[PDB]
Amino acid sequence: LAVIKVVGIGGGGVNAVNRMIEQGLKGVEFIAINTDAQALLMSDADVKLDVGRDSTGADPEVGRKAAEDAKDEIEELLRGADMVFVTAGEGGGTGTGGAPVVASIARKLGALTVGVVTRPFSFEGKRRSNQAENGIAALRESCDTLIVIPNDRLLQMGDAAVSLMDAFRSADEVLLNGVQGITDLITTPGLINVDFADVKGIMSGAGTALMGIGSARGEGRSLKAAEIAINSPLLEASMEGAQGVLMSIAGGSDLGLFEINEAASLVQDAAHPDANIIFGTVIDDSLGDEVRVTVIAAGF
Amino acid sequence: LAVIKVVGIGGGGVNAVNRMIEQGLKGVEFIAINTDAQALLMSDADVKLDVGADPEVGRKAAEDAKDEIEELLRGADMVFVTAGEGGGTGTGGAPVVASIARKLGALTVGVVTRPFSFEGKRRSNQAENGIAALRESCDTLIVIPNDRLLQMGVSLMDAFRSADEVLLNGVQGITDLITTPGLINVDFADVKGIMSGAGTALMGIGSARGEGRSLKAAEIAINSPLLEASMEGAQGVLMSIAGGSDLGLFEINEAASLVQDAAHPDANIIFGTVIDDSLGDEVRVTVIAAGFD
């Protein structure tokens, strides 16, 4: 029985964790770390740590020092995890600076450490983009796998009429998608059980990763969800280059092995010839007649 | 109705208290004291005091807040104090809280962990220094030597989880014995009798299922590596058997007979049971051993 902890650090990561909790992500402990007590009070995370209380403006150096100052405390919170997700919206101060500290503690402990972060929208400005770039470089060194979701690509999905608030909610959602796509394999396996050991096998030291998500209903749903996922703007047309692929297909109790296999076959055909691809399923009865495919691609 | 307050101090202590709450430890009041200026671990504890990695810093912070801590502890018959796992300012603050509790007349029980040897060691022997300081301020100090967890039943993640679980048992095995009805109940006065000024105590735990479960769980607890073979010499022993409502008097009594055989002839022994109908056919025994021959 694998113990999974999902840490949201900084406002963006805390918002993502809140969304996970709201959407009913099970089987994981949620840890919120931020430099803002009021946001933490509003969060229903299991564990809430307010850091940099004396020291505290989007300065990653402030965020790094706040996390480093609290390193013993973070360590004590994470000890015992088999797997730790570190989630943040890169570009700010607390997430950008603090995420690599959290990941490094998780990696030192030997937990399978998976970062899941967004790169900011280009409209957020060049300083945020530059901070995100450096925070991503730092986090990459600290994680087994770091899934980076380019927020710019989210705007090529969903609605052309989206508001600013919708866009950021969609960023929270994709972070949830990235975590859940992996954790649900472990916590709520369907017909094809991909357990913690298998996940560890493919995600350990995998380095930078991208994610694609697809969903569909009715006839040909599993093939359609898979095709959407492998062509996802979030994957940056880089699916064919990935040497390591984890695919999760989720559906209700009635999702058949034939459909699962058809999606798997489509993904194999799309993959790099030498790719190691693990296929897993998830039972989620709340999905009704929807099937959801998530692909995590690494090793380019 | 013994008033029992459980004080977690510093991040590790607050975290321990948060686990106790999450697990539904009953019959006690939880107090979370934060001792760090720079960070605050939040808590659903009844009572929270923010007085904020140096033991000296935590000591000073608690001493600065002595009046407020005193008011929080007033009226307790029993106070548990723990800085939980990992050190920090909590290790400085714990002895101050304990000293206040004891000066108020509460039976004051510290709970302290010795880190695993693989964790290494931070200067000025601060971990043993924390233990010595807490021991001077407590009636009884339950010391949990984490190294011994590796002899029980171990992976790194299992080791840390086992440590958290046993720390929780450090409090719950005793408080449930006092607060939660079982077939065999105890008098708080007898608990106070064996724990008052007792000094260092060790704990043992055992679980078993099926026929002979009570005797089997008790044998495991009394032989627990956590007791460091101290059972033979202990002059004060507390034993609690948790299990279903259907645990029979005969099987309970077999366990009580075992502990008397195993304890020093001159030992005071407090023995009781706890109904926990959620355990199924499992029984869980906790033994606390204090004193020497």
Curated annotation (Swiss-Prot), chain B:
Keyword Cell division recorded: yes
GO cellular component: cell division site; cytoplasm
GO MF term set: GTP binding; GTPase activity
Lineage: superkingdom: Bacteria
GO BP terms in the entry: division septum assembly; FtsZ-dependent cytokinesis; protein polymerization
Residue positions binding GTP: G11, G12, G13, V14, N15, G88, T89, G90, E119, R123, D164
Intracellular or extracellular location(s): Cytoplasm
Main location: cytoplasm
Keywords carried by this UniProt record: Cell cycle, Cell division, Cytoplasm, GTP-binding, Nucleotide-binding, Septation
Protein family according to the UniProt entry: Belongs to the FtsZ family.
Subunit structure as annotated in this protein's UniProt entry: Homodimer. Polymerizes to form a dynamic ring structure in a strictly GTP-dependent manner. Interacts directly with several other division proteins.
Job description of the protein: Essential cell division protein that forms a contractile ring structure (Z ring) at the future cell division site. The regulation of the ring assembly controls the timing and the location of cell division. One of the functions of the FtsZ ring is to recruit other cell division proteins to the septum to produce a new cell wall between the dividing cells.
Protein name, per record: Cell division protein FtsZ
Gene: ftsZ
